[PDB]
Amino acid sequence: PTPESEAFLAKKPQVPPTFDGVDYEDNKRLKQAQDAIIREQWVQVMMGRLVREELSKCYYREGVNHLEKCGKLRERYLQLLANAKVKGYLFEQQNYWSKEN
Amino acid sequence: SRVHRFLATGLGASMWFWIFYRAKKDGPVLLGWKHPWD
Amino acid sequence: MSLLYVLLIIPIIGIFLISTIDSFYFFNVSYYKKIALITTILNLIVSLIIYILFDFSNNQFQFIQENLDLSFYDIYLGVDGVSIYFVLLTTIIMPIALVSNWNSITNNIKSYLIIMLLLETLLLAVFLVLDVLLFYIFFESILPPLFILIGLFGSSNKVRASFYIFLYTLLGSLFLLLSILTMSSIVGTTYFDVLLKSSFEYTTQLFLFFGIFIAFAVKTPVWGLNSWLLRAHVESPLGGSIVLAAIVLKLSLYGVFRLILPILPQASLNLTYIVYAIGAITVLYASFSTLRTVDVKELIAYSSVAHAAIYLMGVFSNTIQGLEGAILLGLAHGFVSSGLFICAGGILYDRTGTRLIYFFRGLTQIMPLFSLFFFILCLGNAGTPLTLNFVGEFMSLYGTLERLPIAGMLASTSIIFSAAYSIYMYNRIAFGGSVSLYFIDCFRDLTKREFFILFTLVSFTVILGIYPSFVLDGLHYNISSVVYGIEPNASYLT
Amino acid sequence: PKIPYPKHVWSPAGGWYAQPANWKQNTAIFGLVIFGITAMVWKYSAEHEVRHKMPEPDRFYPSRYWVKQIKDYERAQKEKQ
Amino acid sequence: LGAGSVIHAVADNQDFRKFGGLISYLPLTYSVMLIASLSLVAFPFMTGFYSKDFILESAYGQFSFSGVAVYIIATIGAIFTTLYSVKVLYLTFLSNPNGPRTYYRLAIDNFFSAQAIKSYKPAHEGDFFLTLPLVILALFSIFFGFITKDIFIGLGSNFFVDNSLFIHPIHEIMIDTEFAVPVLFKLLPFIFTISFSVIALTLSELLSELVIYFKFSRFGYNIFGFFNQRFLIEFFYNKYITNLILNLGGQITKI
Amino acid sequence: MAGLQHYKIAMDPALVRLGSMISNRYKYFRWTKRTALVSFMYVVVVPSTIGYLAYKTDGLWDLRAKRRGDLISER
Amino acid sequence: KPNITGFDMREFLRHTKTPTYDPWERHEAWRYTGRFSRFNRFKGALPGFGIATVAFTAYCV
Amino acid sequence: MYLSIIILPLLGSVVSGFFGRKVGVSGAQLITCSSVIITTILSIIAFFEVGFNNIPVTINIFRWIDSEWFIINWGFQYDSLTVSM
Amino acid sequence: SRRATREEMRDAKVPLAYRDSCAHLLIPLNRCRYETYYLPWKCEDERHSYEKCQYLEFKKRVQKMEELREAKGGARSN
Amino acid sequence: VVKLTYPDRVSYPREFEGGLERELGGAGAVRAFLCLDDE
Amino acid sequence: QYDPPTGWLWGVRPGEKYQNEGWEGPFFYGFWGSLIVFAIAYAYKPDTSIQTWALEEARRRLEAEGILEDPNPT
């Protein structure tokens, strides 16, 4: 894997991207969570951007044959496009949800 | 002038000679008499 | 001392120097205008320094100063990405507005300079305060200087214009104040880092939305609440007009990002169709009346109404591109309306003494430099690509379309009608025959002063129209925080 | 004939029948400037272009003489057997 | 560009009603304008022949009602292309001079006594920069279509395999266009072109009163005006769209 | 006439008078059947129509990543 | 019914021809004479046709 | 060369327009016609490289508009249609 | 004479609309067009062969359609 | 008039082995005619 | 025949020269000078954009899947 850069680590979230068990009176801990949800959404979004870039190269590589040789990237990009979006932290900060409900 | 008339006449001659050439060669196929591979 | 306090302090120093230098040297008014201009340059230099140090992906407010001396009303200053560009717009516009009035202010020059310097401090404080009640205090503080600026330096109808802008803004603001006071009572303060964590209940949000919206629709302005602008933006001196349309219209837009998006998310989403009907109506009605407006400065003033409708619809889109496009359009409008007001209220008006379109025709023949900048500005007003105006209009319009398609489709018709009134006004003034037979004297072309304020404004719109990343890169992370919603397989991770 | 016009109007494109006495000298400088910028653009293009198929050795493909991607491929392909 | 040569030659007049003659005055202009016109009417083995005529038989080659209908529609359009193509060349060059003396007055025939060195302006051709592009474009108008059809049409040509153009196989008609189209409908444009040209050329310079009889009929007068006024679209656009918007703005500003 | 001296302009009195009528026309508006009908149409009817249409189609459609075998409709 | 003015539309077309005598005849005569006769005008309607025909015949042998 | 086709007509245009007083009538015509003719030759060469050898050329310089999912570059693609046009 | 498999049609970059039975004759022609720069006097034999077989297959489908034409009492199919 | 008199198709639709299904994008995309219903 | 290029730039008549109104110093040297300096300073500003940080993590995650090749395999 590509080594995590010195600049990258300076901004890596130290907390999981969640609001469960977060004391909202702890300013530092709440802003840490908000940053983790925001950063995670952007990563998923930037993942789609990289898949689109690969799909672009294969399309201009396979030409006529793109409808058959670019399906794997094609499927990946559509999955990311269907799921990844910068939605903010603020609905999840104000609304708790449970799986068992 | 004289060069203009020569230029005028040359292309007109070029056009009809070109048309006559393709009439003799591609004309039979165009009219449906003969298939290209015959 | 914080750099943000230095931003607010430099113009006050220049006010002090302007008002006292008569005791150390009849001082020439050139000296006064030199002091005020250098004062604005230093304020711009400080804002540039802040931006170089500013970090694009921090959700903590930057360049803040600890108080530890809490009182009832304490000025806390801080900056993030959603306010940093408005601070830059204010510090770039202010020197240009001073140079645009270098010769046309002939009496009461000390008073004019002190008002503009005080306006700089107050408008900057609006973008930098970290408390919602501090926002109202700075938003309303600019009214008395604006009342005096219009009344001391305005045109023939300055009294009616000064009263209109004061009473309209006050009336709308009083409904915002009641909304803010209700928030202050429920939460215990209006400090941003505390109120943004509060969760108002839905019915409270609805009645909070109304009252904040009434004020912001008076200040946008929406069509039907916009006669104060059609008066004040026209009767104002040229420097007043630039400040009023480039920065003062932007207050309601930056106000939406602090007062509605984080704390009234449910009311904002449930009422977007009312916002969009008003914004759609404003886009069509203002466009048609701009087409029939015969005062050149009133025509540029009315086109501001149509552009502000698009950033208002982009700000309620609840999408990243619509929100970023709204800020982009706000900024691009500031450069373009400044240039078109200079072209009309400063170049045509100074030369002819009239603002009626019927007297102008064929100016290109004798004023080629004016017609070149005037045309480029009219393409910016039409949102032509390679201007920052296209980037903002496209992103704002895309977000409005994706949020509510019928509202975006009507709002899109602005691409047809902004071109219509921009091209119509350009053709009638620069083209449309030989030089107007109403001109007895010939006219000189742009002076070096006029050239270099238009060139500077035209430079900003084109450079940012080609590389809008210079603003978007510092917008992305912070503007994420005002989006409301969730994806099903992305939310509630464990 | 030619239309009359004001001599006081200064226009960057020249005006009405504008040709300075030194127009060839000025045209030479600007053409030199145009060449210099174009060459810089040419250098950028020849380094940043991307292809996914390379030309065959016997075909007329003059870009093979300056484009970095093809030059590397041709140099590497010469190492055979 | 050939038209621009004419408009320069006769002092900026642009109305057919003031041309005529000029055939001996602008021989190079006439030749290239004739060459271009035969390409426009898809005369056989000209450059325009290889493109337009294939479009027509391709419309038939897609054996569908819409495809057959457009074929007939575009055939009538081809008829009137020939008509106004004849109208241009004849009214500019082949007809009698409907313009004044100045266009055709030559120094060879003595007309002036003291103003003989100058003052003739006989409507001559243009210079090298005016005429060189005409010669070049004339050559493209004759051979370029033949030289290049195999690229653009071919039959299984693979010029666009980078997927620049995508044709789904279910949308292929070219096989039926090459083999299934009857020969009568393939040469029908040329039969129409070679005949309405005779019909147009005979109606002028030989008849010339029949069209006049049509014009001065109420039926013909109305037909002439309707088509000269471009289906009245500019009239109806200006009335009910442009002026509608201006009056909306008038109401908004005033009431 | 307005601060700085401007160039000599043949200020046409008719055009100036037309400009004065436009600035003062608000002083002479009256409620009539025509003005009330026009004002009601522009201020109430058309905006409420767009408002009703925006209301009824809010959330109706989404285009994002919609494939064949799916619907643009969400509601 | 005949008009108050003596303009008949049918007679207008009957007089739409070249007049036997015209007071302007000699002024307009140049528009149909030698250079602008039927033959001279249409003599070069197909500029290079003769040269092409001769060359084609020599080629066909 | 592929970028040089794009910028060469623009370069001549700014000299003809914004420095017409410097080059005059003849200088303006020499620079524009020269800058268009040279571009045309490079276009003919491009038509052979891209169309006849079926080698498309991609070129991206700097991003234009970058917002989350939209990344639009100042970018150019040469394919068979491009050189045909 | 043997029909080209879908792999070589895919490998030869045959146009998708012509990846039919006769595509085995399209590859030599499209190769020749590449070599001769598509000039319409150089690939004659390959051009006529691909056209002829394509004509032959066309002549088989019109017979197939004519049989279908009588199967419905001469009714319309387009 | 055209609707009353326009000729019937004079050739059976061209068929493709496999319908070019894989090279047209698989079953998720549109394919070519292959031993399907007549037309 | 062509004419000599004429015209008064900034309206300065050929006899005289441009007179400074007093704004030129601060505007050209302060306003434009600072903007030019800031542009040079901006070339050396570190990238703190969310995109740059997020692209690097996205690349690693797509390296983890069978999408992107790993320069440092294991």
Ligand SMILES: CCCCCCCCCCCCCCCCCC(=O)OC[C@H](COP(=O)([O-])OCC[N+](C)(C)C)OC(=O)CCCCCCCCCCCCCCCCC
């Ligand atoms: C979109 C905003 C602008 C971005 C582009 C900024 C310009 C980039 C360079 C453009 C090409 C160079 C233009 C040269 C100027 C034309 C000649 C000239 O000097 O005019 C003075 C001329 C002087 O002409 P003159 O030299 O003949 O002088 C005598 C003529 N009179 C009688 C007028 C004095 O002024 C005019 O006559 C016309 C006035 C309008 C000028 C038109 C603007 C030209 C630039 C158009 C911008 C193109 C935008 C592209 C669209 C966006 C893409 C989506």
